[PDB]
Design a protein around this nucleic acid. Structure first.
Lengths: 761, 50, 688
RNA sequence: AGUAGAAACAAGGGCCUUUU
């Protein structure tokens, strides 16, 4: 308003100047950031003293005049200098009595993190303080329970698209994919009196899991690490049960299970395991709380250092940590080097089998359940191993898997009699190296493990070293103990390195990392297991258990949703032209008509043929209901009694209005259709009464060749633009572009892959 | 970030805001024309000056 | 994101990244271009959009991603089969339907320079499409399919946003064909210098670079040189057991004199019932003056000792007149001027106005820096310590907050320990001095801030509580502060301190003060003594004295570091037993080692921390930094660890260098010597 | 006078720069 005129006059005054005009004219807008530093640069060494100094002053505070005048609060209620025409005391007067905000219940959403902290803390049953020398391990962890953890780029787009839409940047992939989260955030913080910067900063903190390198004891869960300071120190422990707070392990566990399942499925195709794996990953999703997320993004966000996730991250191309693996064991190379060197091993009598072994000094941290180690190898020999675990069995298993890692012992020279050529290799036509065979051998029976440990030389426990010794049963001390097996108390501190290594994978799912090393494989996973996954979507033929009927209905609904794109002879355009009659002869309804229960098909068509008209003509319609009931409008109307439900030929119905398993939706997430527990994405080409907003149209538009003839419109006027009509539009900051309302988003990955495959012929 | 200068961004955004508030908000065609004329004068002055 | 490949995978598909990487490796060019080529390759593949010809067969055939060797082979094969003319240069795609090649290009600048150059090079032979990131197309023929255009322009828009975000939308990463050689702008002068910094053997950076890039290892020569350096050194190694630590030598001279601003042991105080309404400094001073005991004081002309008596007597009378007037502002007279040095600041002389004659008229020579002088061990410090380890007949001298609620056992334990320690520590005399410092310096801080340029009057007071009861305001003495115009950090502003006493002044100890016997006071009647000092302070000393409450934290930390450790070795709550029983040696008497529970050695610890706050200087810093070696040697001796060193004599010299005119340093050194002596009876590595 | 350190203050500009 008049303020606008003032802003324009100010701009005019500035441009009348010469220097400001020069700096504004030249360069791009980024210069602002730079200038933001050349100004207001001043700090102070001891701020505390300065504050005490200033507070004493006659009038320390600063307050805007217009706010004080608007408040109409007494100048000096009792001979107190609230302001010349301000003291700190003034704030007290305001707080005790003064202008009251209509409601302050929005603060609970702004600071959802801290209220969550308080809510979690109120449910902790404190048991009993005890005293003892706690064993603490210094390891990286996360100290904030967070849902839907994202990167800084996504967070930045979330803030811009939830607060400043008029200055929103061009629609990203994430915003289109995750529209339920953006809608949920937008609703709470729209048309509200708020300091926007504060809210943005708090959403940044909301979506950032604070990872720190700390001493730790006991379980590792963000719910505890946020208050670890009040659970135990080096000398005391305040017992407390924190199991049932913000369960974050069940979703990580489910993600790992799903990755295991897909990786085990996609090993069947010898020639095309990799491509099948990628296709399997892309055509799958899972529900997190309220929202449904694509598996690929979840895998990219996660930090689970496990062979399943490692392989999937490699396949998609995600970079991952410098973390090796060997079965259900963990490793981390502290130092050293080496180079492959082949050696033969006779399985039975004379049966040469080649195996490669590194040749150099090499230190290695290791981590098995409730045990840790710091071993070293040298030219096909286990030089030493220092353990700091706390369980006899975990200690033994760790030592054995470490020995195997380094191919030490006579068995590698002269294989045990028991192992045969049938199990050595080619379970499914793929060779299995010796080391994994020995691993399976040890897992198979304890006696083999005992034989392996016996293979390492045994000596007599010298005096003094009794405490630093390990028998065959993992005894703390004995009279005879394993050669060069030191033992100590206290978990070995986990190393740390903020490095990111690119690593590929072979046709046999062998993840190389810019060198020979095999970071992970499919032969270091549980054999197999059956699981019933909840709230997941395996939209792929091979990964499906349903019959042809519900699959056919779901396919028909997908086909109907495939005509929701832009262009004439389509549902949205026809609705704009109010030509409901054409909808009744669309190809997809003709394809879907056979399914419709023929006995009362006509009656169903009449009711739905009526509903669409009422929705279409009036201008108030439910897109979801329209898609739901278009299949019945193929046949000629008839006469009959309508019970209330529109059946198919498979004893599955849909009631017009109330969600059911066969067809569900929600006003919260209006971009999903749940057909028999299958998530069907609807494109965002046209808004509906509930979903109506700036976002529901973004997919339809796209950029095109610049044309200065087309008009310049507002963001809201986008709703009014014709299909296949060009228009210029300000986007983000300092960008004027041209948009054409035709959906053109073909698959980029598929085409690029195909061309690359062709390049190899 | 962009390719426009500061002046150009202010010019276009201000014009868009004025159009949005004349369309629906409490602004009169006279006020909209006055502001737009002021903006045109400011742009001309900025470019001509240096 | 530390390498370019990751940045390209952010938007580009990783496959195209690998392709462009292999291509760069084959050509041998910088890898900085992995992005540009990748973008071009992606544009072509997406451009193709699996389009088909009339024959239901593929329409576009790529030639770009293929290796150079097979590129010209496919090009010639196609130019021949369809009976086309061979082109001199290479292209990117071969449209079969129109039987002609199509090159593609991408120029950041919105100008036709690149298109013009490319068209000139290729003329009109084939179809060229010069896209632009900001929506511009330059061609020489009909435009492509609309879908193809909208996919190219969307991809380019996203890519330009993701570059502009990272500050990589420049010629460096997106150059044209010509501007492909980025290099540091080697200047004539920079080279002229670099060629002069090359070590003596070499004479040009080229020789040094050629010698370093090909440097090979010759361990024989390196080891020989190492041994020759290991022989011409003869590094001494000294196991302490054989070479013992001689006792520290302390300086010699007169006893170290009292330096703290406010008297502790001697100071005599006046009490008055607390008035909440009148809680201000001046209000308390006036109320104390009104009873009339203060107005009785009438110092004698002759002081017991000290100098400048007349000035002090005049200032005392002026202060009394000020209070009588209820205006605590002193006028600037000769006595105040002299004590405050208002005008005793040397006046700067310009150098341009100087001449040998001026030098002759008044002596002119570089300031003969008067380093401090050495003072011998103080024999009075022990008395102050013992006095400070006694109760003050009052409690709650230092203020405190209110303890918060509790929910878990741990909090109850913390609150019980804190309550016990605070109760023990609130009755002593050291805490009375803590309160006196906190309040007096707070008042003086809030005066120097408000009324600089006016020699205000501030009292030396405190607040306390009678044991179990009412509260009490105590008045140890009076202060004043000369102009505190603290324009800069770490300023300087003289103050003046009058304080009462009932004790005769020592000559060696109370050298600073200038006492005046002042009548009598009841308790029976007793003489009085008016101790008139003239000290100085700064901002930093003020803030730290006003935050002296820190000592409680350190003392509690030590006590609970001992109690939790003793409790863990037994896995049971052993704190009260440790506090009551555990005996801590705290001195010697009659040649024996005295010991008392921890509950009574908290007082010693607290006094130690307070004195660290008070007498802190560079000397104490250096000392406490150089004594650690000796304590580590002691521990090594206790555990029979054959410690050793290279030159202990130098260490002792360094230590004795930082012992000058600071009582605390000297006292602690004498105690350290007595410690090593007493331990020599049960340990080694120390000489007598 | 005093402070403290390995040099600086002991106001500077032309009349200005009270609640533990």
């Amino acid at each position: 308003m008049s303020l606008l005129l003032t802003i324009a006059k100010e701009y005019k005054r500035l441009c009348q100047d010469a220097k400001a005009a020069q700096m504004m004219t030249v360069g791009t807008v980024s210069n602002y950031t730079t200038f933001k530093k050349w100004t207001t640069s001043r700090k102070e060494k001891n701020p505390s003293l300065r504050m005490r100094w200033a507070m004493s002053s006659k009038f320390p505070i600063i307050a805007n005049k217009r706010m004080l005048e608007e408040a109409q609060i007494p100048k000096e209620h009792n001979n107190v200098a609230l302001w010349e025409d301000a003291s700190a005391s003034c704030i007290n007067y305001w707080n005790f009595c003064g202008p009251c905000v209509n409601n302050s219940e929005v603060i609970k959403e702004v600071y959802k993190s801290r209220f969550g902290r308080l809510e979690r803390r109120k449910e902790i049953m404190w048991k009993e303080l005890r005293f003892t020398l706690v064993d603490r391990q210094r390891r990286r962890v996360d100290t904030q329970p967070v849902e839907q953890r994202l990167r800084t780029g996504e967070i930045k787009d979330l803030q811009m698209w939830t607060l400043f839409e008029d200055e929103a940047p061009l629609a990203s992939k994430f915003i289109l994919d995750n529209y339920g989260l953006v809608k949920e955030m937008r609703s709470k913080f729209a048309n509200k009196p708020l300091n926007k910067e504060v809210v943005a900063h708090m959403l940044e903190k909301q979506f950032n899991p604070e990872s720190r390198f700390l001493p730790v004891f006991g379980a590792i869960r963000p719910e505890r690490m946020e208050l670890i300071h009040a659970l135990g120190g080096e000398t005391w422990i305040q017992e407390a049960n924190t199991a049932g707070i913000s369960n974050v392990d069940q979703r990580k566990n489910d993600i790992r299970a799903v990755c295991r399942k897909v990786c085990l499925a996609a090993n069947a195709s010898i020639m095309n395991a990799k491509s099948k794996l990628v296709e399997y990953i892309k055509s799958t999703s899972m529900r997190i709380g309220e929202t449904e997320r694509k598996l690929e993004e979840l895998i990219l966000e996660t930090d689970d250092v496990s062979p399943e996730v490692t392989l999937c991250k490699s396949a998609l191309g995600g970079q991952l940590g410098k973390t090796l693996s060997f079965g259900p064991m963990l490793l981390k190379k502290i130092s050293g080097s080496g180079v492959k060197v082949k050696d033969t091993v006779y399985i039975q009598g004379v049966r040469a089998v080649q195996f490669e072994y590194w040749s150099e000094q090499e230190e290695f941290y290791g981590e098995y359940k409730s045990a840790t180690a710091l071993f070293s190898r040298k030219e096909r020999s286990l030089e030493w191993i220092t353990i700091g675990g706390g369980i006899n069995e975990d200690r033994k298993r760790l030592l054995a898997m470490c020995m195997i890692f380094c191919r030490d012992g006579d068995y590698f020279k002269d294989a045990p009699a028991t192992i045969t050529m049938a199990d050595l290799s080619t379970k499914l036509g793929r060779e299995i190296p010796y080391q994994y065979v020995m691993m399976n051998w040890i897992q198979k029976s304890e006696d083999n493990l005992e034989a392996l440990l016996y293979s390492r030389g045994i000596v007599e426990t010298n005096p003094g070293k009794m405490g630093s010794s390990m028998g065959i049963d993992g005894s703390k001390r004995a009279i005879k103990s394993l050669r060069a097996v030191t033992i100590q108390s206290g978990k070995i501190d986990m190393p740390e390195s903020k490095e990111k290594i690119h690593l590929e994978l072979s046709d046999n799912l062998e993840a190389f990392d810019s060198s020979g090393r095999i970071v992970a494989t499919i032969l270091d996973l549980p054999s197999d297991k059956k699981v019933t996954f909840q709230d997941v979507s395996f939209q792929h033929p091979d990964l499906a258990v349903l019959r042809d009927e519900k699959t056919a209905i779901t396919k028909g609904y997908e086909a109907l949703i495939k005509r929701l794109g832009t262009g004439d002879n389509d549902i949205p355009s026809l609705i704009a032209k109010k030509d409901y009659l054409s909808l009744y002869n669309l190809p997809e309804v003709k394809l879907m008509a056979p399914l419709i229960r023929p006995n009362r098909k006509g009656v169903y068509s009449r009711v739905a043929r009526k509903l669409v008209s009422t929705q279409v003509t009036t201008g108030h319609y439910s897109l979801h209901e329209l898609i739901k009931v278009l299949p019945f409008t193929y046949f000629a109307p008839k006469q009959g009694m309508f019970e209330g439900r529109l059946f198919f030929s498979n004893d599955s119905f849909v009631e017009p209005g109330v969600n059911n398993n066969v067809f569900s939706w929600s006003k919260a997430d209006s971009s999903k259709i749940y057909c028999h527990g299958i998530a069907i994405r609807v494109p965002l080409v046209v808004g509906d009464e509930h979903m109506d907003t700036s976002l529901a149209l973004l997919e339809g538009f796209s950029v095109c060749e610049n044309d200065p003839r087309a008009p310049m419109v507002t963001r809201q006027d986008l709703i009014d633009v014709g299909f296949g009509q060009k228009v210029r539009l300000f986007v983000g900051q300092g960008s004027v572009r041209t948009f054409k309302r035709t959906a053109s988003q073909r698959a980029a990955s598929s085409d690029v892959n195909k061309n690359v495959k062709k390049i190899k012929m | 970030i962009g390719a426009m200068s500061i002046g150009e961004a202010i010019e276009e955004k201000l014009l868009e805001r004025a159009k949005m508030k004349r369309d629906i908000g409490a602004i009169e065609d006279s006020e909209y024309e006055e502001i737009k004329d002021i903006i045109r004068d400011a742009k001309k002055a900025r470019l001509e000056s240096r | 994101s530390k390498t370019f490949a990751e940045i390209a995978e952010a938007f580009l598909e990783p496959e195209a990244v690998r392709i462009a990487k292999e291509a760069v490796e084959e050509y041998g060019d910088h890898e900085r271009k992995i992005i540009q080529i990748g973008i071009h390759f992606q544009v072509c593949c997406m451009f193709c959009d699996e389009y088909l010809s009339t024959n239901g067969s593929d329409r576009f055939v790529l030639i770009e991603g293929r290796k150079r060797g097979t590129a010209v082979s496919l090009q010639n094969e196609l130019c021949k089969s369809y009976d086309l003319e061979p082109l001199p240069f290479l292209c990117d795609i071969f449209d079969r339907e129109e039987k002609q090649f199509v090159e593609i290009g991408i120029t950041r600048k919105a100008d036709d320079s690149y298109f013009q150059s490319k068209f000139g090079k290729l003329g009109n032979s084939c179809k060229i499409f010069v896209f632009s990131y900001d929506g511009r197309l330059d061609k020489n023929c009909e435009g492509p399919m609309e879908e193809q255009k909208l996919r190219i322009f969307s991809f380019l828009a996203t890519a330009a946003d993701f570059l502009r975000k990272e500050n990589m939308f420049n010629e460096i990463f997106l150059p044209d064909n010509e501007e492909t050689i980025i290099e540091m702008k080697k200047g004539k002068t920079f080279l002229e210098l670099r060629d002069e910094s090359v070590p003596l053997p070499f004479q040009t950076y080229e020789q040094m670079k050629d010698y370093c890039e090909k440097f090979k290892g010759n361990p024989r020569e390196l080891a020989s040189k190492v041994s020759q350096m290991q022989s011409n050194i003869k590094l001494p190694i000294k196991h302490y057991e054989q070479n013992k630590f001689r006792q520290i030598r302390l300086p010699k001279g007169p006893m170290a004199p009292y330096t703290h601003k406010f008297l502790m042991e001697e100071a005599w105080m006046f009490t008055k019932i607390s008035d909440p309404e009148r809680s201000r400094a001046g209000e308390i001073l006036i109320d104390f003056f009104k009873k009339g005991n203060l107005s009785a004081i009438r110092p004698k002309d002759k002081p017991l000792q000290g100098k400048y008596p007349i000035h002090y007597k005049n200032l005392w009378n002026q202060i009394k007149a000020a209070i009588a007037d209820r205006t605590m502002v002193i006028n600037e007279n000769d006595h105040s001027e002299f004590l405050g040095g208002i005008g005793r600041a040397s006046k700067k002389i310009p150098e341009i106005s100087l001449t040998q004659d001026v030098i002759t008229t008044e002596g002119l020579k570089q300031s003969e820096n008067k380093l401090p002088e050495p003072r011998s061990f103080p024999r009075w410090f022990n008395a102050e310590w013992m006095w400070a380890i006694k109760d003050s007949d009052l409690t709650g001298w230092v203020p405190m907050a209110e303890y918060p609620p509790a929910d878990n056992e741990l909090e109850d334990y913390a609150e019980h320990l804190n309550k016990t320690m605070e109760g023990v520590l609130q009755g002593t005399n050291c805490a009375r001095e803590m309160g006196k410092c906190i309040l007096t310096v707070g008042a003086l801080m809030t005066e120097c801030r408000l009324f600089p340029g006016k020699i205000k009057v501030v009292p030396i007071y405190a607040r306390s509580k009678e044991r179990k009861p009412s509260e009490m305001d105590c008045l140890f003495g009076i202060c004043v502060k000369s102009k505190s115009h603290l324009n800069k950090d770490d300023g300087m502003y003289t103050i003046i301190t009058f304080e009462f006493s009932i004790r005769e002044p020592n000559l060696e100890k109370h050298q600073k003060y200038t006492v005046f016997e002042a009548g009598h006071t009841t308790v029976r009647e007793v003489p009085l003594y008016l101790y008139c000092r003239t000290t100085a302070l700064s901002k930093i000393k003020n803030d730290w004295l006003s935050k002296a409450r820190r000592c409680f934290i350190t003392t509690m930390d030590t006590v609970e570091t001992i109690c939790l450790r003793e409790s863990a070795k037994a896995e049971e709550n052993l704190v009260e037993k440790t506090l009551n029983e555990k005996q801590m040696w705290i001195g010697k008497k009659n040649g024996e080692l005295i010991a008392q529970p921890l509950r009574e050695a908290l007082r010693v610890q607290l006094v130690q921390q307070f004195y660290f706050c008070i007498y802190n200087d560079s000397q104490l810093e250096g000392f406490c930094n150089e004594q650690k070696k000796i304590l580590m040697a002691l521990e090594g001796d206790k555990k029979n660890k054959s410690s050793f060193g290279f030159n202990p004599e130098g260490l002792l010299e360094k230590i004795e260098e930082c012992l000058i005119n600071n009582p605390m340093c000297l006292f602690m050194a004498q105690r350290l010597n007595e410690l090593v002596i007493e331990a020599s009876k049960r340990g080694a590595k120390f000489f007598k």
